[PDB]
Design a binder for this molecule. Structure first.
Ligand SMILES: NC(=O)C1=CN([C@@H]2O[C@H](COP(=O)(O)OP(=O)(O)OC[C@H]3O[C@@H](n4cnc5c(N)ncnc54)[C@H](OP(=O)(O)O)[C@@H]3O)[C@@H](O)[C@H]2O)C=CC1
Ligand SMILES: CCc1nc(N)nc(N)c1C#C[C@H](C)c1cc(OC)cc(-c2ccncc2)c1
Length: 189
């Protein structure tokens, strides 16, 4: 099944957090994340979200598990097991897929350690990067960064992203405060 990374990062250094939290609250970006990770093409299927343990624990109490999606939590301590109908515990993406039944799309949703490893895993064929801009990038506190060899990847045209997201609205240069952001798709060369 189709495995993709979905992330929002501040250019050009591709920062994603400071002190274990996100340096922005972008309202439309959140809805985009929600729609893309939920939308299925075929009947009787749903999407999977894979995340690290720390990321799982960072999600607001009443937002976890993320509804309408199969949640996979990663820990190097976990046994490959099905907790309930919505939650799976695993020690690798390799194992979690073998435990999965009838999943259409798989989304890697965080965090920094999970991103920086799975980026070089050949099962991952797509990057969904919300590229964020700011007039003064250095003036925002940042400690955790993406380590993406984007030279080895190809930014696709908007029309390929539009096919991927289906009937989802893709606006240009979304301005929330001083931040400006765009949605982009990447594939392996
Ligand atoms: N902008 C964005 O789209 C997003 C940004 N973020 C940011 O990222 C930061 C979180 O990153 P981080 O602290 O690294 O959290 P992670 O979600 O990456 O948690 C890391 C944990 O995942 C487990 N793990 C890591 N690698 C593997 C592996 N290969 N196989 C199995 N388990 C593994 C380990 O658990 P264990 O110790 O149990 O073995 C480890 O402790 C936050 O600051 C947040 O702001 C997060 C999500 C999205
Ligand atoms: C920015 C949303 C987001 N956008 C994109 N493009 N990629 C991502 N990987 C995430 C993400 C994320 C993590 C899992 C997260 C952390 C959190 O705690 C800070 C709250 C939410 C969340 C708030 C609102 N609704 C559902 C989930 C999501």
């Amino acid at each position: 099944p189709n495995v993709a990374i979905i992330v929002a990062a501040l250019k050009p250094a591709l920062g994603i957090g400071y002190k274990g939290k996100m340096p922005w609250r972008l309202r439309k970006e959140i809805r985009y994340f929600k729609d893309v990770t939920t939308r299925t093409t075929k009947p009787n299927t749903r999407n999977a979200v894979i995340m690290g343990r720390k990321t799982w624990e960072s999600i607001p109490q009443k937002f976890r598990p993320l509804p309408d999606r199969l949640n996979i939590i990663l820990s190097r301590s976990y046994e490959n097991e099905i907790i309930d109908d919505n939650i799976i515990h695993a020690s690798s993406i390799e194992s979690s897929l073998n435990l999965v039944s009838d999943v259409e799309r798989v989304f890697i949703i965080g965090g920094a350690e999970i991103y920086n490893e799975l980026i070089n895993n050949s099962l991952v064929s797509h990057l969904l990067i919300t590229e964020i801009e700011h007039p003064s990038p250095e003036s925002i506190e940042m400690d955790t960064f993406l380590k993406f060899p984007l030279e080895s990847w190809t930014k696709q045209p908007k029309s390929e992203l539009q096919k991927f997201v289906g009937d989802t609205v893709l606006e240009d240069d979304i301005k929330e405060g001083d931040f400006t952001y765009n949605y982009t798709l990447w594939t392996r060369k």
